[model samples]
Target: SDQQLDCALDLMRRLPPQQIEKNLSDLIDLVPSLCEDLLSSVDQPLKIARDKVVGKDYLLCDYNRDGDSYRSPWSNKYDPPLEDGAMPSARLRKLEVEANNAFDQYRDLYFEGGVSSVYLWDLDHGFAGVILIKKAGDGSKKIKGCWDSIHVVEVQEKSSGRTAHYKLTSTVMLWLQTNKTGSGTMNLGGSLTRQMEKDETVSDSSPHIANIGRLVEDMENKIRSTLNEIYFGKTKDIVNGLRSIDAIPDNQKYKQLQRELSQVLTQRQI
Candidate 1:
């Protein structure tokens, strides 16, 4: 009967009018989308499989180029760019092998429910970090399940490519109800960031180190290709149209002037 709107309206009658309005205003701003992820994610939810990266013979990014936008070779994404291009550094190989192995151990434990832990690699991984996806600052999440991570990788990959360097960090927020549905939840947002350049100056800027930079870049390329091997698991919608969903309003567009020269030199518009 009086569950939500009606229930909330009842509260308004008892509380001071100003106080009720103030509280309701804040609540409305928190969600804004009314939350929906109802259509996507049935048995399969989008896993953070960026590590599904690997190549021929299961080698880490066996290719040097960007394989895919989300699963490209690993890199700091900083600049002066690597001589090998945005290719991941070769200093590390078989990274996904180690991370996935660790995840297998952790993912299962998390579902068991309780405090748990797992290393990205039992041995030297050069880099790794923990991921804690929380909803409402708790175990709840939009996907209905939860996972966490722990890593200690170097700042070898710039979190952003400020100069092709990186975005420093990537942020995207959306409104989606927990698989529980009915109850709408939202966040200011969520994000994904990359690693940063290592403090390589510690090695002394030797000529060999500079030359080896090329060597390293070459290796990164190999791994990037290798990653092309993995299927990137499955794809699902994460972010959809903000305007289509009414999350934000249209700002209006401008393209008012057409340039027409008196003299025409036409050859395929060149």
Candidate 2:
């Protein structure tokens, strides 16, 4: 359950800050749509997510600053990591899928963005989710790095400060499947943590991880928009074609479809 969070964050990081928004919005295209706003939310502070948002608060993960600081659990770095494997069970298998998906994001980032590296994890899910990227040259600044070639993601917490000792106590939900149908869902939920270590340092930075959050969010919107053009274009092509008419009453030449349209009664073969 907790592993998904790590997998999720890694999933997120591979997404270049420049294109994450597009990726997420594109997701909307993948399903269905509309909210003038691009949004992210943590709908319930204490409730589990359901199949739909209808039963929960309109609250979004976009950020509710008023909420207690529950340092994000799915981090590539910036805070302490979890040895989620500590309690591995059948869940170990689910971890593999997440692990791959998480790793795959980096590959995408590399090709799509300039993500030279997405490696920074030690499996216990800690310390190294930070990423690496290569610098560009004569190449047009017209192109940009995920976040100004973001070399690292600096996550700063106001409550815990830039440097702090922390403890992450999480309550997760995991259901064991007793049958072999393999159609049931398993291991899913969220977590809350407390960060306490501190030092004489700033809790925020313009190029820090927190800022990267904004970049990630914005990029997601952009990517979503890009995909909309593509996916929707496909949808249109799928449904768009010369209108047709049943020609059961067709004469030798054609069947009048409307004042300006008709169906060719036969292939002229010319």
Candidate 3:
């Protein structure tokens, strides 16, 4: 059973990087069609699939260890509007509470658990390097713990069709946890990085078009190889069979070969 599970997970990981990029592009292209399908399905007003599950509801608040208070982040909003007037499932709410509690415990227990510094990269702003955290002993009280650290990387398409650039930055803070008789402080960090490179543009008069043609051919071959690995076992026989099928256009012969291969796989437990 372990071997079978490993085989399934390995199959999941076999997606080639280039193929993944192309698949993502294809998915983006199909968004319009997908939206139409979603709208059509909802119009039917049929009962969708559902099953009973545990859930929870936890307020998203800023934890101030010094004051021992949970403060709402929403200033004017106060109570945020719910989607479809629905609360989170009990299981999800419980998970959220547990996660927040664990993060608070970790911050109090570990010395390096809080944000220690921040760095920003902006070409126009000329922003660079780290901003160190001020210690509590320097008269600056330790900052409160809110959410877990996060890293967000985004790639944007530039308007200029010719040139593109990258931006990266991170915000980190330091916090202290208070216990019954003592307290401990720690530094935690979070970051976001992004890059957007120029897309290859082609001109009808450019001689590099031939090179671009070759590149496209190579990319198609790579995609085919990836599909083969995912849909069929990467065995010599499988490869040979695929090559043979390319030459032989007989439908019955192909079916016969496929049936035989299925039987072989059944025997080998593959």
Candidate 4:
């Protein structure tokens, strides 16, 4: 039963854009008792990531979240409920600084040009961090691509940091907007999630920090491709069904048009 539960939860977590609600509801309908258990199991760790703030924490990403706020990047201060959280230790602060520098550089190189921030806080057994990246659009640009992504990570150390468990919740928000000379404005927005949980023993050459870094790098890369192929590309395919574009050659276009028209007629007749 537990294994089945894991299988179901894994499918839900990896569900593609725009299908999560319907598919998850269908699953819950088939297994009513699994609702609370499944949701709480997912919610509990996220709550930990959101509320696990420290006194000396640095800049964190902003979400449309309520309560359990972290220190803001803009003002370097907390938002209510824990305004008096104590200063971070020197060790944690140094690490946080290093992470910020490293992550910002990564963001610039990955996104081409964007704003990024990293926040780290010490935990009893290990550490947790949030990584944020944002690329904003401007009216001046003809074709503007805007996006923001957040990754919340929880790490638990074992055996003197020789091994660890890592949990990552990644949320990506995408916006593609454009103004063309002949056409009206076009705007699209989508949000996607990809979560990962794993435990591994660190090799002699690889440290826990490298593990986290590589995991995040791979996650972002995968999300980028997923957005392009599954989300954006699929949407374009749907749009082309109504009004085709010029990518195809004229001969093939004619054939496709006739094929689609015949299919529509057959369906209507049936």
Candidate 5:
């Protein structure tokens, strides 16, 4: 009890002196609905990240043409034809084979711990691409896992009347996590497509990045709060309700009510 009081006092002291009263009031009015929204967002990012890591079954290559899919040369039927709308020359095919080999080597290096395998997508018919790591225990076969029997497409960018030529785009990343009992399972966490246009531009000052970081921190805090309530049987509903009220724009009266409620709630030794 005494420790809880001390912790509460410490939190109070940490608040900005000028805005402490107002902030507390606002929180009291706006917490409930905001907490729910925050919880929803937390799961979204995790799902995206997971799917990008482990869920891709096949890789699609975007050569600079319309219809050229990369198939493993080692496949049973090896007919080098200029079909599928786009066909690579013998020289180009050799390069593709080498690139695929390099991807396999890289994946082997990174596949460990909770990671079972890695998938590489070579975009624009070149060596550059993204790496997707598979979570451990994903039952994908190594034969199917190899860069074989996959399809490719030709991608073109047009600006005005001119057409710009770029290498094929294929690559992805994957994330895998281990369960408590050391069992491995795969989930389709997330996938990322590279944007070549932005690759040349490096930014040291991005307000958007800062904003995203702030939001991530806020979401983490909300998740922690919810978990606490679940484990300790605390009634977070009231706190969440207060936070919602405080979020109301241009509603000074409700804000004031929030402040008073926080003070009253905190002052009592529960």
Candidate 6:
């Protein structure tokens, strides 16, 4: 515990509040003897603020918090705790259902099989939401890949009446494995951003769905094709260059002899 105390202090001081708050147990378990001190350190500010005269209602336990709101695990949305026996607005509920159905159809058509989910939350200006997609192979093939993607979009209406702006942040996670080639594996992850504005001609429903679908499809296709080129084309080329897998032909005996002779001469010189 004493040795770990130094490292823990450094991490606690440097790491963001979210990190400390989210993985509180990992830290406590990492340095068991310092658990009490660790909690005090993190909670000290909140404690002090509560005692002060001007402190407004403070919240500390919610790790997935935005201001005073908390994200619901079931809905995957960030909102302030609701009043007892209350529900979300009907319009919001309708939109959520429509968005979910659209994304489900998209997953069926685009991925063929996998899971997809979208969660939207109301915001003061406009709204924000997240789209998650995951697909994995059955492992029966020689080469298999798994894909996971997350897209977060925030939409706001332009002050001038007719247009709306969309800002998107996306992350694509890729995992590739070759069971036949002595267990080769690769894991890759990348993030991208896109921002665009569109005239709000189509009603509130379809246009948002359509825009999100298009962006997701475009990003997925680009990443898929690029992976095909790099993993299958260029990587195979390098592997074959290092060690030829094809059978050597006897017709090229003279050429092979010439290469072997030079290789022997080089070895002798070495």
Q: Which of the numbered candidates is closest to the native, going by highest lDDT?
A: 4
Provide TM-scores for the models: 0.23, 0.22, 0.19, 0.59, 0.28, 0.51
Compare candidates 5 and 6 on TM-score and give the better one: 6
C-alpha-based local distance difference test score of model 5: 0.33
- Per-residue lDDT for 105 in model 2? 64
lDDT of 1 by residue, 28-83 (tens): 45533321211110011122323222321111111221323222223223112234
> How do the residues 78-195 of candidate 4 rate in per-residue lDDT, one tens digit apiece?
5566656544567866776677777767877887766666667778988887777777667587887667777888888886747889998877777676778675777666567899
Best by TM-score: 4
Q: Please state the error at residue 21 of candidate 6 in Å.
A: 16
lDDT of 1: 0.29
RMSD of each: 22.7, 21.4, 26.4, 8.7, 20.1, 13.2
Evaluate model 6: give its TM-score: 0.51
Q: Tell me the tens digit of each residue's lDDT in model 2 across 144-245.
A: 211211122223334543452222211111111222246343221222112222222335353223333343334444544544554345534664554434
Full-model lDDT for every candidate: 0.29, 0.31, 0.31, 0.67, 0.33, 0.57
Backbone clash tally (model 2): 28
> How do the residues 23-121 of candidate 3 rate in per-residue lDDT, one tens digit apiece?
434433555444333222111101111112212122321111012222121121113332332222454334333434433443345324432211122
| Tens digit per residue, CA lDDT, model 5, 19-98 | 43465445435554443333221111111121223232323222221333333222211122445534345564554445
Off by over 4 Å in 6: 1-90, 159-162, 181-206, 233-270
Higher TM-score: candidate 1 or 2?
Answer: 1
What is candidate 6's lDDT per residue for 145-190, written digit by digit as tens? Answer: 6666666677775566635566666555555656454655543322
Residues forming the 10-long window of minimal summed lDDT in candidate 1:
35-44
| lDDT over C-alpha atoms for residue 250 of model 3 | 53
Better of 2 and 6 by TM-score: 6
